[PDB]
């Protein structure tokens, strides 16, 4: 019942990334320093690379929650410019008006 | 919309009764409540920030409205 | 030199609300607060007074019936602090093992038929049921006359 | 149909006396109800040769957060009932200078009131502790060591040490930490280490 | 570029205020930053970005079948789908389609 | 005539613990509408006067956040729609309150915060030196 | 030509309400906002979750009271409370209104975990501001 | 009256039901807006004023020193060397984290202890002794 298959794929990515965040943070910390031996840091490089691809947070996309538009989204409302304007121009967003100055 | 003279007369009676209610709400003397006190009371009770003052809540004598 | 600090004053969480309520009296021009304050919806007779409230109570029962029928839809808790009273209710026994401890649940849920049937099965299996548990079953059975307490709908 | 369609009763403002106890009509914050407010208030930008719209079915008046429950009469009645809950400020602490002498430390905390289902606000945990170093029993060495340890937390113009704490989840934990930091700073400043001779 | 006194005073203040005590380069300081904040994936904005579209859709479908919600949109596409059956444009049986 | 005979007043118990002393309370209220802040100020100041609280009001400068969006759904980049959110402020500065007085006043004015108005209450509490800091242990 | 939320001129026979007659450049000049909360104030959080809730509530009330609503909802949020103010018609029987108010207040309180009140104001017919 | 009642003994179904009948004689419909707010407050539905942003949240009754001082948890790790320096950086970050509970912070440290126990052979090759 998500807007489209693309939104559904992003929902799964956000869920998998959440489940693996602690493990990824712990392994990444082992790699992001010059203190630990390079042999250990090389094994950590392989371990974080073996985690499922959809756990990688860079793959998450901030899509419009109403229409799934992947671009033109305002992060504060999580809405595409078109959907935001539709709600704003009808006076349904508290405190948002047309700007003239 | 046409406002007949009888209708205006009924609106004046309504303004006089409302004027006494507003003085009673604000705890002031009904007999010395002026139009400038009415405007101050309406502004406090019904605060409107609309930039255009003609769109704000108003309680005036029917002779000045109609 | 010494400064004397006043002693603290403590009140209940509803005390201030109760103090503000004491200042107001019943409005004689209005119908009871339970009703909608609208000339079309205000009750205009003693019968409408009863029926309008019964209709409102029926609406609340229908909503509660749906909430308990489909808990999944009302399990996302966004309230802070958590509000236990606004969560769905689960009336079915969640312990499926045949034991005295699992029987206690059915008595707490007031399942007269489930509890009696399970108590019989427990007795046939030959496991020991504590006197206190048996007394609790009798309390449930004696109070309700071996009849199921009324439920929303089956 | 056995009767005709249900007719709406006349508005109950027609039964209201001009000397009623208005606070009893609007005891708490409620939406504007045209049938309960006995005022011929109008609102709306008028059409040409027109008048502002009447109050019945007026959605602009419904959009206003009215103050009908907070008339000057009600506020005075409300505050008379709330005087029992108040305690008296110490008369000795007349001025701010007197407050500083008897109570050298000042703790700032902030509470945030927003509208929504959750009251949580991560900004509420912050605690700020301010104390003038002149109110502390510091000798010459101790004062100099303290000023060096704290760094920019000390302001020479005001002579105030500001300790802001926001490490812990709760405000009470950050308060306990702020007081603890002041304690170890005081005692460490007084301690003299052998390496201090290399100054 | 610090005196011994200044260096030892900075190390004492850092111990007092809970900061890093050993000499640490900027690369290794990332470990401190990593564990002082929540990972981006763990922030509520991230994992609760979308509303639960399954709950909204399923609730309002159940309420429609119960008679308590009128879905004007769903009514519109039920009339269209009904007129397409009378016209012969019916969805075929899965597997037993036009092609084979 | 149908008036309540006697009224149960809420029980306020005087404790044996000393009260908190607030040097200042800074009640900053934010809103999108200036007239609503005017009404709230009048109410808050009147409530303070009736309770014996010293109050001073000032208006911190307003903040206008503006942003731009495309006019059309597709192409026509030169054409934009510009929106804004105006945040107006009013700051009530109370002074020389006790914990009980502040608790009552804040509950009263916070419960009557009009829809669309936020509040940030900064409380400065007067404290005495910790017991451990009275003299050095070394 | 601009289109957004502009009821366009007809033959002078189309009745429009006061809200529908005012284009978006009047939203802080002649008409107010249909929702008042703190999400969109400077330094305030959760504007996104408030927005989704408002969109759902307007859909919920449109389908729950089919053909009854005479104008747009006014959503109010004060602290934990949510107050829905609806201008409805005088066609549906009062018994059915009371049922639907008890049902919607209960169902929505359990869905958004907060006390919800519904304040109905009835009008004989749709209030016509002008004929476009 | 009786000097000591059986408070520990749970009430029977009869006592519970009888206490429900005594709450009905005093049951009336809400009389005004104040009474509705009072009822909601008693049920826990309405926020209690003045607003406390931490209402209902006491992070396991933890103290400030349990969040900020985390070296007690590093006693199984080598006392010197790279692993010590690394774990001191982990605990410094954790001590600065207001978003984690003490339980969550100890889980992080416990994970590293097991991890370095798995990697003993790799660590020995690089002149490091773990446990
Ligand atoms: Mg990206
Ligand atoms: Mg153009």
- What is the number of helical segments of chain G per DSSP (H or I, 4+ residues)? 2
Strands across the major sheet of chain A, in which order? 1-2
Q: Please summarize the sheet with the most strands of chain A.
A: 2 strands, antiparallel
Strand runs of chain A, count: 3
- The oligomeric state of the chains shown is part of a larger assembly
Fraction of residues in helix of chain A = 40-55%
The radius of gyration computed from the alpha-carbon positions of chain A, rounded to a whole number of angstroms, is 20 Å
Distance between the termini of chain G: 18 Å
Biggest interface in this structure? Answer: D-F, 49 and 49 residues
Radius of gyration of chain G: 17 Å
Q: Structural class of chain G, please? A: alpha/beta
Order of helices and strands of chain A: HHEEHE
Strand order of the largest sheet of chain G: 2-3-4-5
User: Proportion of β residues of chain A?
Assistant: 5-15%
- The total of beta strands of chain G comes to 6
Overall tally of structural domains of chain A: 1
User: N-to-C SSE series of chain G?
Assistant: EEHEEHEE
Anisotropy-based shape of chain A: elongated
- Kindly state the percentage of residues in helix of chain G: 25-40%
Structural class by sheet pairing and helices of chain A: mainly alpha
Count of helix runs of chain A: 3
PDB class: ribosome
Keywords: ribosome, tRNA, 2Fe-2S clusters, polyamines, post-translation modifications
Entry title: Human mitochondrial ribosome at 2.2 A resolution (bound to partly built tRNAs and mRNA)
Chain A: 28S ribosomal protein S14, mitochondrial
Description:
Chain A is mainly alpha-helical and 101 residues long. Chain A has one domain (1-91). Chain A is built from three helices and three strands; from the N terminus they run ααββαβ. Chain A has a two-stranded antiparallel ribbon with strand order 1-2. In chain A, helix 1 (5-31) packs antiparallel against helix 2. Chain B is 56% helix and 0% strand. Chain B is built from three helices and no strands. Chain B is flat. Helices cover 45% and strands 3% of the residues of chain C. The relative contact order of chain C is 0.07. Chain G has 132 residues and is α/β, with parallel strands linked by helices. Helices cover 28% and strands 21% of the residues of chain G. Chain G has two helices and six strands; from the N terminus they run E-E-H-E-E-H-E-E. Chain G has helices at 47-64, 94-112, and strands at residues 15-16, 35-36, 74-78, 81-89, 116-123, 130-131. Chains D and F meet through helix 2, helix 3, strand 1 and helix 5 of D and helix 1, strand 5, helix 2 and strand 6 of F. Strand 3 (96-98) of chain A pairs antiparallel with strand 5 (80-98) of chain F, so a sheet runs across the interface. The structure holds magnesium ion (2 copies). The PDB classes it as ribosome. The entry lists the keywords ribosome, mitochondrial translation, tRNA, mRNA, 2Fe-2S clusters, polyamines, rRNA modifications, post-translation modifications, cryo EM. Human mitochondrial ribosome at 2.2 A resolution (bound to partly built tRNAs and mRNA). Chain A is 28S ribosomal protein S14, mitochondrial. Organism of A: Homo sapiens.
